[PDB]
Amino acid sequence: QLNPESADLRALAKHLYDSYIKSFPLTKAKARAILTGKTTDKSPFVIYDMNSLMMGEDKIKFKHITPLQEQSKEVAIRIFQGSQFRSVEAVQEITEYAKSIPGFVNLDLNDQVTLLKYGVHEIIYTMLASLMNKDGVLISEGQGFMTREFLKSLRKPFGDFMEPKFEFAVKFNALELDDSDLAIFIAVIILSGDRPGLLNVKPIEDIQDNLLQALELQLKLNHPESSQLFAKLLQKMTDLRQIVTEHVQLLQVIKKTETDMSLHPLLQEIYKDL
């Protein structure tokens, strides 16, 4: 119970959390409810092999996550392209959230683009953890669940495109953060003044500082018993970079190995000279 300074920090966290619920259709709260398999109304269909994938398509309504095409004749590529269009959608969701971050749209246009360019994938993997457990990941807005082993057995290049994420997710999830915490953390990620090419770093840092103050307060009030949670969370920022890097790397291999597979233009630009 304290000052007007802390009051503004609480108002900020509320605004961000509010925007978060409004920008992301599938929150961590909903993901855990589905994953903890509590209910009889939210049960996901599980894909763990070829025949379940074959049934899942029939049961699950995979809203063109892999736009028009029969069977690209390779589950591996269908699955991959799918992960791509979903990524694109995720970028759309994140971009919308970014606009709600106080001060973000007031920044220089080119810098707005730079921050999104380097921040969206770090955010994507951060939020993906919410949809994961050590055994698999939720898909189709929680309608389905694809096992970690099914993926890990796809085929040479693809067979391991999600593993690093799972390794991250299991660790990150140990922090037991909730949507109210993630909303501010993701805002911090985007307002990173050390992104390559930023024209005006100061205004960005001023904004990030306020967000960090907001995040720090949020974590002590929400997780009283979690000593140094603030620092452990910030330290996870290093794991995200690594995830992104080896992903981009695997992508260069795919590009050369699959001369016959199209990669989404938005994603290509995001990875250009990244």
Ligand X SMILES: CCCCC/C=C\C=C1\C(=O)C=C[C@@H]1C/C=C\CCCC(=O)O
Q: Residues comprising the binding site for rosiglitazone?
A: 84-87, 121, 247, 271
Give the list of residues 6+ apart from residue 113 with CB closer than 8 angstroms, or none: none
- In the bound state with a copy of itself, the residue whose beta carbon lies nearer, of 96 and 163, is 163
- From 67, 121, 71, 111, select the one nearest 91 (Cα to Cα): 121
Among 31, 34, 77, 84, indicate the residue that binds ligand X (CB under 6 A): 84
Q: Which helix (H) or strand (E) holds 184?
A: helix 179-190
Q: Is 22 in the site for a copy of itself (CB under 8 A)?
A: no
Counting contacts by CB under 6 A, is residue 119 touching ligand X? no
- Would you count residue 207 as binding ligand X (CB under 6 A)? no
Q: How far apart are the first and last CA of the chain?
A: 44
User: In angstroms, rounded to a whole number, what is the distance separating the alpha carbons of residues 84 and 123?
Assistant: 15
Instruction: Name which position in 26, 60, 212, 263 contacts a copy of itself (CB under 8 A).
Output: 212
E strands of 88-203, at which residues? 132-133, 136-139, 144-147
Q: Is 125 in the site for a copy of itself (CB under 8 A)?
A: no
Distance in Å, CB of 70 to a copy of itself, minimum = 38
Contact status: 153 vs a copy of itself (CB under 8 A): no
- Kindly tell me which residue out of 49, 57, 178, 239 binds a copy of itself, with binding defined by CB under 8 A: 239
Distance CA 44, CA 165 (A): 21
- The residue among 186 and 217 lying less far from ligand X, judged by its C-beta, is 186
What is the DSSP pairing of strand 136-139 with strand 132-133? antiparallel
Rounded CA gap, 83 and 88, in Å? 9
Q: Of 86 and 165, which has the nearer Cβ to a copy of itself?
A: 165
Q: What does the binding site for a copy of itself look like in residue numbers (CB under 8 A)?
A: 171, 194, 209, 212-213, 216, 227-228, 230-231, 234-235, 237-239, 241-242
